[PDB]
Design a protein around this ligand. Structure first.
Ligand SMILES: Nc1ncnc2c1ncn2[C@@H]1O[C@H](COP(=O)(O)OP(=O)(O)OC[C@H]2O[C@H](O)[C@H](O)[C@@H]2O)[C@@H](O)[C@H]1O
Length: 232
């Protein structure tokens, strides 16, 4: 049985949950979260993938095929939504019912059932992670994390730990990351990238064999260059 939250445990939520759903939408929503990993989603008549040519694990290139650690890390030029991995990361807020930035894009692509699922829990604390189905994303699951506002390294680190912990607890083998806290939350990019990479490296060293790919999705060229520069 899945661990769906890393931490310890509304009229808007009420409105969302009372909104009409079709039988076909109900059928997708009814899929036990743990079954979604392996289900043939095309067997559900209400499902589709909303990303036409998703980028799969075998299409990514590791930073370095020969390093023990960097063979499990890839950089990707583009939105995290393109990635067909076990899980993608959303940079949410504590309410965790959508927003702008990557949170907006993920909800657009995933479709309205993602926000419906989010309304079943009481948001998400800073540094923690909530696990939901990915609905219309090529990715299976979303790991919604809430990064700090401003440079609070231990919370940003916590975010990365919480994400990687839930993937480990539930047997997710590949994760697509976005640059959490670095857009509207204004965490400085190079310091944020250091943490993202430092934490993923530490996790990979301790839990080698649990994960096959940590892909860092760089929606902006300067994120991609910062990541590139950080990994030699
Ligand atoms: N349209 C997009 N598509 C894909 N990736 C994007 C997009 N826009 C930004 N990114 C990338 O997404 C990454 C994260 O930037 P941010 O989304 O700002 O998140 P945060 O943690 O700093 O701010 C969170 C708040 O913003 C939201 O309103 C939430 O609801 C929160 O309230 C960067 O790589 C961006 O380039």
């Amino acid at each position: 049985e899945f661990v769906t939250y890393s931490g310890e445990e509304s009229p808007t939520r009420t409105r969302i949950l009372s909104a009409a759903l079709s039988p076909a939408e109900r059928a997708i929503f009814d899929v036990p979260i743990e079954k979604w990993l392996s289900i043939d989603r095309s067997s559900l008549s209400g499902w589709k993938c909303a990303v036409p040519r998703p980028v799969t694990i075998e299409q990514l290139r590791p930073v370095d095929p020969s390093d023990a650690i960097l063979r499990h890390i890839a950089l990707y030029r583009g939105p995290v939504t393109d990635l067909q991995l076990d899980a993608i990361v959303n940079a949410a807020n504590t309410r965790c019912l959508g927003g702008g930035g990557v949170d907006g894009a993920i909800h657009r692509v995933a479709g309205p059932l993602l926000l419906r699922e989010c309304a079943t829990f009481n948001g998400c604390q800073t540094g923690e992670c909530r696990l939901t189905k990915g609905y219309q994303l090529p990715a299976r699951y979303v790991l919604h994390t809430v990064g700090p506002v401003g440079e609070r390294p231990d919370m940003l680190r916590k975010c990365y730990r919480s994400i990687l912990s839930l993937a480990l607890k539930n047997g997710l083998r590949s994760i697509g990351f976005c640059c959490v806290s670095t857009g509207v939350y204004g965490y400085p990019l190079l310091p944020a990238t250091r943490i993202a990479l430092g934490e993923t490296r530490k996790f990979l060293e301790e839990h080698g064999g649990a994960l096959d790919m940590c892909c860092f999705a760089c929606f902006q060229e300067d994120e991609y260059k910062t990541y590139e520069k950080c990994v030699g």
